[PDB]
Amino acid sequence: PGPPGPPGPPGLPGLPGPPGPPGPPGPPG
Amino acid sequence: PPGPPGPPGPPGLPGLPGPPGPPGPPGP
Amino acid sequence: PPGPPGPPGPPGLPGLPGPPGPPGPPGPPG
Incomplete structure (x- = not known):
C-alpha cells in the first residue's frame, strides 16, 4: 500500500x- | 495513500x- | 491502499x- x-x-x-x-523539628520548648 | x-x-x-x-510544632 | 498505522x-x-x-516533628523539650 x-x-x-x-x-x-x-x-x-x-x-x-x-x-x-x-520538615525540620519545631522550635525548642 | x-x-x-x-x-x-x-x-x-x-x-x-x-x-x-x-x-514542626514547638517542643515540650 | 492506505499503508500501516504510524x-x-x-x-x-x-x-x-x-x-x-x-x-x-515537635521540637526538643526544654
Whole structure:
C-alpha cells in the first residue's frame, strides 16, 4: 500500500512526584 | 495513500519530589 | 491502499512536582 502513517500523539503527562521530605523539628520548648 | 496516525505515546516520567514540609510544632 | 498505522507517539511530559512534605516533628523539650 502506501507508507506508514505519522507518529501518534504524544503521551499524557506523568504522575506527580511523591510528597517532599518532612520538615525540620519545631522550635525548642 | 499514507497510513493512519499511530496511537498515543506512553505517559511521561513521574514528577520530582515535592518541597520540604514546614517546621514542626514547638517542643515540650 | 492506505499503508500501516504510524508508530506510537513519543512519551509525555514529566509530571508535576509532588506536594510539600508534612510538618516536622515537635521540637526538643526544654
